[PDB]
């Protein structure tokens, strides 16, 4: 009484509503530190003038 386990399972069946269907989630956070920027885009570099 008033003492419950904090976690609970998901019910994932093939027949479940799209709202209840499983979704895989990736969250990308972008960070500028006290450090060189080391993750860059594929944009090609050029000569310096």
């Amino acid at each position: 009484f008033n003492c419950y386990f904090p976690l609970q399972s998901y019910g994932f069946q093939p027949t479940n509503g799209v709202g209840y269907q499983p979704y895989r989630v990736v969250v990308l956070s972008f960070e500028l530190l006290h450090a060189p920027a080391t993750v860059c885009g594929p944009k090609k570099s050029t000569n310096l003038v």
Partner: nanobody, 125 residues
């Protein structure tokens, strides 16, 4: 998983008995085990459940205060202590495994479980 029960047999009313059921394979750390029983000609009935993590126990009313369920995590074994045996307690008892985790323990009384042991007969004279 495979569930194997032991400890059934003939006992006189008023005695006490400890059941054993070893759980093996992919034993989830945040699951629970329950014991249920089916008497000849009756529906399967929940007896007691224990959560593997933390060891909190939930009992059916017919046995609460008389029976104790326990588990030894290191040994992966759950026990049903059947004290004050009565005639009506005569039945086949099955050890049952839950994979799904519930926030409300009482839900394990009604949840349909995944795997069942073979059962061991206890008969109370």
């Amino acid at each position: 998983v495979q569930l194997v029960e032991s400890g059934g047999g003939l006992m006189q009313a008023g005695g006490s008995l400890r059941l054993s059921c070893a759980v093996s394979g992919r034993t989830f750390s945040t699951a629970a085990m329950g014991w249920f029983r089916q008497a000849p000609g009756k529906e399967r009935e929940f007896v007691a459940a224990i959560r593997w993590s933390g060891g909190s126990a939930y009992y059916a009313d017919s046995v609460k205060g008389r029976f104790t369920i326990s588990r030894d995590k290191a040994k992966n074994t759950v026990y049903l202590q059947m004290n004050s045996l009565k005639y009506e307690d005569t039945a086949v008892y099955y050890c049952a495994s839950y994979q799904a985790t519930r926030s409300l323990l009482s839900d394990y009384a009604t949840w349909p479980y995944d795997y069942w042991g073979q059962g061991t007969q206890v008969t109370v004279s």
